[PDB]
Ligand binder design. Structure first.
Ligand code: HEM
Ligand code: HEM
Lengths: 368, 368
């Protein structure tokens, strides 16, 4: 019996080989933020900021207040699986005299033909991912990180997201997105032999045990999507909406049943379409290209014509974007059945170092 | 209490009163207003409320929509979903129902501290959606909005949140983003004068057992608030942040300890300040004016200058605004210590009829 109090009492590790928020389970509430360093903030001011943030992360993740004038917003809650994760944009390095430590992996993402990117709401010197299963715990951490920046950095953009809550379902199971799809079945998992090689930089040296995140604010064209038949929607993905099983499966097939990419109709046509999203994204269709996807859904209102500003805050993790996000998205751009129903409207690519050790701050190897 | 309770708990649709008034607080909220389209009169509004009521009934039972279900809520339990319907002053002129317009919908005063967005205020029709799972809540918002179809457009829509079930080690009163205990003195069904305070009795007959809701989008000036000392913040409310007790209370006092309004300190100054919010808002300071308060917090991001668009979606419930919201806000406008740290930025006043009986729709006695 998992008690209801688990939601609040569950606590994620701040200190680790890897920073939290990568392999951490899905969280109900998410806030992504980018900061740009102030004019005249250099290496010294950035190091001080990262120390402040790391101290704040550490305290909050353990359910402790920030300091004396902590706002009390998270008071009485448990840690609620709070995680805070820090990353560095390509632009950070030129602001701090660290151009020679800028990883080749931060080279800008391609200009994909399907891009519709608000560049103000994209990129940034610094990125912070906050997640928790309690909205006050999450907001408290966002506000404390944002206040820590003070005048030394400014908020460039900031997006809010959500997922299913713990306990929403009778048993824990893969999440859904706002298209109503089972979303998360085929991620690489810790314990798989190639997981570390796929996801983490091995033990420039400041990125040891780090990962590269790609964030994409992807609007779902729900007004078009929701006029489609079940067949049409399922053909876009290649998996069933009911349980996430491959379309190649029978009634007995489940979410775990392997996809049969050769199966055909009586009539000769492939049961899993040739441009289905869950076919064409697989590592075995992309020379081994792989990523961990760990997103939040978003809804930020309606425009004048009733169009919802709703979608997926797509967040993926990889040891090298050129063996993950980039080749896959090159294929998806025009080659994916899903592309017609979505719009990439903001993006970022950030270097996320290893977890801090006792006494350390996140990114200390880089800044020291 | 098992974690699955978050999902399995179910609020009732059918009843003497609509859900979402006395219902416990929920972790996720969507408030939406709609305006009737050209060509939508009384008969089109009745059909709309019939649609909406059927959707609310199904969804509140954890069932899919009756048709074109998106699967977004699939596998989740009801998650304490509630859906609540009301009518604005403007509705009655659009449908030929001017003779049924309650006096209670007469426009709120123009308070000197108002800073209202006219286009995010008011509206013909109001819907309140809340749940403890965000996919359940979004699925209900999207279904209600899609039921509107050609009958009505979305005028405005706001997202809110609260604490999650299980975030605390045992159930406690909510906090808000000012870090205050928020909800202590909310009237409850078993207390002495509750029905007379909150519900139209068995004023136009179609509102029998209904209530009047006042919605205020109140931005919290957190940048100014959070530079105050603890003493200053506690003086603004009249209650302690740590435990919500009256400042007049001793070391043993808790949130429910009765406030002493006459208690002075060693220098003869009142311990609960004369302009403290939790003094001046009490029914006994307002000729018996009272309301149920059942809000959500909001955070919609930052403006270009770093100012959070964050605050309280204040939602209050009363039998008559003239003996609830209106006289209290008249007092608060300039009189309240809190007023300095908030701004009222949107408003709505809606008539929320009684609940639907078995085989009925909400608002039936008005629209048919
Ligand atoms: C809003 C946009 C998107 C939606 C709705 C979506 C939805 C899905 C769904 C339903 C699945 C199948 C179940 C699963 O294995 O998780 C999936 C798998 C996947 N998606 Fe997406 N996706 C989106 C965008 C992206 C993008 C932009 C990328 C990469 C550039 C991506 C990469 C993948 C990968 C790698 C898989 C797993 C492939 C495999 O089976 O091995 N998706 N996606
Ligand atoms: C951002 C805006 C506001 C904040 C932060 C706020 C905060 C609070 C807090 C902390 C309490 C004390 C604990 C409790 O009993 O709930 C309280 C009580 C109350 N507030 Fe507010 N409030 C706000 C706006 C309003 C407005 C606009 C009204 C009515 C016009 C209102 C009416 C009340 C009433 C009636 C009480 C209970 C008084 C009693 O002890 O009988 N508040 N509020």
């Amino acid at each position: 019996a998992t008690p209801l109090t688990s939601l609040g009492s569950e606590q994620a590790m701040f200190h680790g080989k890897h920073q939290p928020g990568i392999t951490t389970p899905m969280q109900a509430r998410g806030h992504l933020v980018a900061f740009d360093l102030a004019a005249g903030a250099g290496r010294k001011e950035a190091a001080a900021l990262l120390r402040r943030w790391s101290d704040t992360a550490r305290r909050l993740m353990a359910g402790e207040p920030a300091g004396s004038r902590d706002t009390d917003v998270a008071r009485d809650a448990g840690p609620s699986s709070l995680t805070v994760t820090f990353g560095f944009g390509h632009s950070f390095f030129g602001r701090t005299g660290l151009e020679k430590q800028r990883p080749v992996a931060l080279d800008p993402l391609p200009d994909f033909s399907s891009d519709h990117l608000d560049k103000n709401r994209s990129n940034g010197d610094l990125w912070v991912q906050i997640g928790a299963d309690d909205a006050l715990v999450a907001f408290h951490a966002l506000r404390a990180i944002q206040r820590d920046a003070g005048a030394a950095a400014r908020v460039r953009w900031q997006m809010n997201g959500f997922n299913r809550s713990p306990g929403a379902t009778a048993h824990p199971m893969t999440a859904r997105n706002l298209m109503g799809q089972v979303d998360g079945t085929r991620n690489p998992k810790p314990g798989e032999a190639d997981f570390d090689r796929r996801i983490f930089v091995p033990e420039p040296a400041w990125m040891a045990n780090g990962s590269y995140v790609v964030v994409r604010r992807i609007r779902m064209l729900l007004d078009d999507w929701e006029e489609l038949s079940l067949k049409a929607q399922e053909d876009v993905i290649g998996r069933r909406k009911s349980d996430g099983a491959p379309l190649s499966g029978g009634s007995g097939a489940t979410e775990s049943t392997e996809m049969d990419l050769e199966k055909t109709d009586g009539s000769g046509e492939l049961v899993v379409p040739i441009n289905a999203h869950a076919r064409i994204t697989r590592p075995d269709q992309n020379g081994g290209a792989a990523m961990v996807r760990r997103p939040f859904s978003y809804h930020d209102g309606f425009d004048a014509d009733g169009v919802p500003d709703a979608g997926l805050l797509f967040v993926c993790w990889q040891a090298d974007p050129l063996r993950g996000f980039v080749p896959v998205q090159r294929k998806l751009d025009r080659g994916d059945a899903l592309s017609q129903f979505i719009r990439h409207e903001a993006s970022g690519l950030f270097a996320v170092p290893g977890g801090a050790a006792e006494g350390e701050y996140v990114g200390q190897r880089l800044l020291e």
